[PDB]
Amino acid sequence: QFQFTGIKKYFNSYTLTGRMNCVLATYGGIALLVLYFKLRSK
Amino acid sequence: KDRRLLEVKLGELPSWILMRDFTPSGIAGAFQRGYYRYYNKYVNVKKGSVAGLSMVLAAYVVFNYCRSYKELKHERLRKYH
Amino acid sequence: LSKARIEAYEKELEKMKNIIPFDQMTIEDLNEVFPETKLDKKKYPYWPHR
Amino acid sequence: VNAAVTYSKPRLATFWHYAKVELVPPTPAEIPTAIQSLKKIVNSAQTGSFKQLTVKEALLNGLVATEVLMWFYVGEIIARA
Amino acid sequence: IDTAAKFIGAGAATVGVAGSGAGIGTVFGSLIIGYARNPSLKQQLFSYAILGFALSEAMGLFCLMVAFLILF
Amino acid sequence: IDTAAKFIGAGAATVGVAGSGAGIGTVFGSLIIGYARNPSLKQQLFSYAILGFALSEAMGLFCLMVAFLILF
Amino acid sequence: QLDTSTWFITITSMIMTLFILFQLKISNYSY
Amino acid sequence: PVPPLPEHGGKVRLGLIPEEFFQFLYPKTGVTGPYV
Amino acid sequence: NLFASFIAPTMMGLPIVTLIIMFPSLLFPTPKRLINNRTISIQQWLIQLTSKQMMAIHNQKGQTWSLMLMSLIMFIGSTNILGLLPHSFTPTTQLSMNLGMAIPLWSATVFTGFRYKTKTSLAHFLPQGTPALLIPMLVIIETISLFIQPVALAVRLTANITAGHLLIHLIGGATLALLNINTMTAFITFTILILLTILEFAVALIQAYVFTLLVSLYLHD
């Protein structure tokens, strides 16, 4: 709403590199899948 | 009527329930009022004291104690009856 | 020319004399009264020219 | 010692007059007064009751009632030894 | 069967605190000699000493966590 | 019994981490006395200290990783 | 105990608070 | 042009309990009522 | 028993980890006037004092990261200090958020370095100067040394706080038990003495966590 314009410069200027959270998401998903498989094996 | 709940008459409680409209102000409005009522009275002064934060910390401690009661009474009890 | 400049200086001195006691002042009004910091150093949390 | 002089002596002079006036078994002469107060309670109990009165007065009455409630708890500790 | 093995493993694992003790002894010992060089800047060297001690403690504290893990 | 052997081996494996504490204590102890001698080259001294602390941590965490792997 | 494979909520909430709330409040400062 | 702040806030006994609670029960409980 | 607080993601009918982790932000009022009360002046003075001591190394590009680092240090420091309360729940205990903190910033630095200074960013693997004739041996040393930074950076934080709380709880249990058998106030003396160190051990961890990232960023900037 009225908060995007406050830090819009930051988001589109310098956090471009820091915006790579894909590695963390993939690692978390893989860990969760492995844990689910282990739990299902029982 | 529209006066404060501590001022409404005992038999006027159903009447003030009809006057409860806009008192939540979409729920968030009541919290908006409540935050500033305390902040502008015990913090936003020329010179405050440690009493500004101690109330909040004690409330946090008591709220935390309320959550763990289940486990404590489960086995931490010393005696019986 | 000198009289015109003198009148302008008198007006400016009168403006300077009338001033809020800085307790009720906000940040913008101080920029109004005197020039102060700007936003030329973009992408900064301080904007002080470092 | 000196702290005892500054507190216990005020305990026996200032706190003594503060409490002994309000904390002492009552004279039997006030029993009819209490009975008249019971009649005051009954008159509202039959009709009127709240009579659209202030919430604050009810809160005062409830708080004093809770103070009265505490003494019965104290008695159990006294008997427990 | 397993209780004895876990207990002896915990007892063996708890010997990792020697390194931290030696390190903290070494750092504070260096501080007193360094201070004696010049009494000025004592707060700065003291800050360095405190940082070093805290870092050594952090590097040596997670040994006991394995002991508590094996115990429970 | 095999699980008991794994537990005791993991418990005895962690004791090698004590080397990290002594090395950390020594490296930091040198920085304070060296700085006190020549309070001019703060930047190079701190860079070398940081390099040493980064390199010295490898062995202890390596041993801890070996213990974690063998236990599980 | 610390590994129960329910890590989605904490990560989401931490990202939200750190990258919105604190930066916005800390930006309104002078020096 | 924000108006000036008040010099003080409220008075608290023991650093945790405000004075308004003491004032509220004064006519009935008395001076030493609430402590009991 | 002991492992009750740690494995307890704010037990309730509906999880409230978000409420617990967002609570610390309600302690930093935002300034709104030229002259303010005492509670915020100290905060801004502290922020100014801390800023000039850490971000005074980077030339121009590192000055952009100033807001992020200050927010990070304030957040971690506020989270750790609030956990000393008798029945609190420190979010930093959980490994999930520690793992979700280290990886993004480390990745940002490492592939920011390659984007602009690829020639020099590739050279940092080989130590500067001539390292005799042992080049292939140390080349594989520093590259594996690269990957261990986030793991240690998370694990030390995940470990030390739990160790401290375990010590406090065990000493409390010990001083409770010895009440029945004989009289010994040495244990409560140990507790009150250790509490000072546990109180002042958090801020050092905050400082180290921030400083290591500062150094890592400055290398590739």
UniProtKB/Swiss-Prot annotation, chain B:
Predominant location: mitochondrion
Set out the biological process GO terms recorded for this chain's protein.
ATP biosynthetic process; proton transmembrane transport
Q: State whether keyword Transport applies.
A: yes
Listed transmembrane segments: 55-72
Q: Can you supply one Gene Ontology CC term for this chain's record?
A: mitochondrial inner membrane
Among InterPro entries, the record links this protein to:
F1F0-ATPsyn_F_prd (IPR019344)
Function text: Subunit f, of the mitochondrial membrane ATP synthase complex (F(1)F(0) ATP synthase or Complex V) that produces ATP from ADP in the presence of a proton gradient across the membrane which is generated by electron transport complexes of the respiratory chain. ATP synthase complex consist of a soluble F(1) head domain - the catalytic core - and a membrane F(1) domain - the membrane proton channel. These two domains are linked by a central stalk rotating inside the F(1) region and a stationary peripheral stalk.
UniProt record similarity statement: Belongs to the ATPase F chain family.
The protein's name is ATP synthase F(0) complex subunit f, mitochondrial
| Gene giving rise to this polypeptide | ATP5MF
Swiss-Prot record, chain G:
Q: How does it assemble?
A: Component of the ATP synthase complex composed at least of ATP5F1A/subunit alpha, ATP5F1B/subunit beta, ATP5MC1/subunit c (homooctomer), MT-ATP6/subunit a, MT-ATP8/subunit 8, ATP5ME/subunit e, ATP5MF/subunit f, ATP5MG/subunit g, ATP5MK/subunit k, ATP5MJ/subunit j, ATP5F1C/subunit gamma, ATP5F1D/subunit delta, ATP5F1E/subunit epsilon, ATP5PF/subunit F6, ATP5PB/subunit b, ATP5PD/subunit d, ATP5PO/subunit OSCP.
What does the sequence similarity comment in the record state about its family? Belongs to the ATPase protein 8 family.
Kindly list the places in or outside the cell where this protein is found, as annotated in its UniProt entry.
Mitochondrion membrane
Membrane-spanning intervals of the chain:
6-22
Q: What does this protein do?
A: Subunit 8, of the mitochondrial membrane ATP synthase complex (F(1)F(0) ATP synthase or Complex V) that produces ATP from ADP in the presence of a proton gradient across the membrane which is generated by electron transport complexes of the respiratory chain. ATP synthase complex consist of a soluble F(1) head domain - the catalytic core - and a membrane F(1) domain - the membrane proton channel. These two domains are linked by a central stalk rotating inside the F(1) region and a stationary peripheral stalk.
What is the protein name stated in its UniProt record?
ATP synthase F(0) complex subunit 8
Q: Which residues of the full protein are shown?
A: 3 to 33 of 67
**Which organism encodes this protein?**
Sus scrofa (Pig)
Disulfide bond positions:
none
Swiss-Prot record, chain I:
Q: How does it assemble?
A: Component of the ATP synthase complex composed at least of ATP5F1A/subunit alpha, ATP5F1B/subunit beta, ATP5MC1/subunit c (homooctomer), MT-ATP6/subunit a, MT-ATP8/subunit 8, ATP5ME/subunit e, ATP5MF/subunit f, ATP5MG/subunit g, ATP5MK/subunit k, ATP5MJ/subunit j, ATP5F1C/subunit gamma, ATP5F1D/subunit delta, ATP5F1E/subunit epsilon, ATP5PF/subunit F6, ATP5PB/subunit b, ATP5PD/subunit d, ATP5PO/subunit OSCP.
Catalytic activity field:
H(+)(in) = H(+)(out)
Q: Which InterPro entries match?
A: ATP_synth_F0_asu, ATP_synth_F0_asu_AS, ATP_synth_F0_asu_bact/mt, F0_ATP_A_sf
Spell out the disulfide connections. Answer: none
What family is it from?
Belongs to the ATPase A chain family.
Superkingdom in the source lineage:
Eukaryota
User: What Gene Ontology terms describe where this protein resides (cellular component)?
Assistant: mitochondrial inner membrane; proton-transporting ATP synthase complex
List the transmembrane segments.
Answer: 3-23, 65-85, 94-114, 133-153, 161-181, 186-206
PROSITE patterns named among the record's database cross-references: ATPASE_A (PS00449)
Location in or out of the cell: Mitochondrion inner membrane
Some GO term, biological process aspect, for this entry: which one? Answer: proton transmembrane transport
What gene name is listed for this protein? MT-ATP6
Q: Which SUPFAM superfamilies match?
A: F1F0 ATP synthase subunit A (SSF81336)
User: Which UniProt keywords are listed?
Assistant: ATP synthesis, CF(0), Hydrogen ion transport, Ion transport, Membrane, Mitochondrion, Mitochondrion inner membrane, Transmembrane, Transmembrane helix, Transport
Q: What is this protein called?
A: ATP synthase F(0) complex subunit a
* Predominant cellular place of this UniProt entry's protein: mitochondrion
